[PDB]
Write a structure and sequence with these properties.
The structure is cut from a larger assembly and holds 2 copies of chain A. By secondary structure, chain A is of the alpha+beta class. The longest helix of chain A has 9 residues. In chain A, 16% of the residues are buried. The interface between A and B is small, with 6 and 4 residues. The PDB classes it as lyase. Keywords: Campylobacter jejuni, serine protease, HtrA. The entry is titled "Campylobacter jejuni serine protease HtrA".
Chain lengths: 144, 144
């Protein structure tokens, strides 16, 4: 059975019974693999690993020991950028070292907890509207 | 002073003074003992040991790794039974290894706290109505 859309695998599994191994095929960036997948339901999974917009990103919580802006936490709590690996959709799209993420997709974060909650939704997006505080100003970016 | 009820002990303490040592008799199962007790208030107690129907049971928390039942945590949050001691009140009563306590005294449990909390009331219960899911199904017991 051939898959292009969510309802395709979904109903395709409505027609398959448990515990038989499917040797299904799947791609990533620009290469296909074939591997072997037991049918396991929702009641049936131990767990696991992901990334996308967090691939080779070193980031951490903050209240930074810099100047000057403004006295409210509201516009500084978020997450600091140590490093950005070039392949990541950030550096496709002008994300850089020394930035501070204040929000992801028009919505604001206080920390790695809020970052990772939004960063878990980014492969549900074709791009993201991030806001990153630089040395002086927050720029809006368009990450692809 | 001879004891058969709690209003024997309670009202005997109503008629006994502080700090003295009291060489009381007590029994277990089929063996009486004497040891000596300091009169120690409610406002007076340094901590101890509490077994009965938990006595040496090996039970831990679950969402288990098998099928099938239902699509809700409500019947499957609980605790799961690695072993059951022969000397204990479960094996007098039809309880076994491979079981899963979902409820105790017609009240349901989510983990080891709600187990222990209710197996802290079984010496208040002439018998217990526990409910034990097994490999496929869940059975009321008469824990004597």
């Amino acid at each position: 059975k051939v898959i292009k859309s969510p309802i395709d695998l979904k109903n395709y599994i409505g027609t398959l019974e448990i515990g038989q191994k499917i040797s299904l095929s799947y791609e990533r960036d620009g290469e296909n693999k074939q591997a072997s997948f037991i049918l396991k339901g929702e009641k049936e999974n131990p767990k696991g690993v992901q990334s996308d917009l967090i691939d080779g990103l070193s980031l951490r919580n903050l209240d930074p020991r810099l100047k000057d802006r403004l006295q409210i936490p509201k516009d500084v709590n978020g997450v600091l950028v140590d490093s950005v690996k070039e392949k990541s959709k950030g550096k496709n799209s002008g994300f850089q070292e020394g930035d501070i993420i204040i929000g992801v997709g028009q919505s604001e974060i206080k920390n790695l907890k809020d970052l990772e909650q939004a960063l878990k939704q980014v492969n549900k997006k074709e791009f993201t509207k991030v806001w990153v505080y630089r040395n002086g100003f927050a720029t809006l970016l368009v990450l692809k």
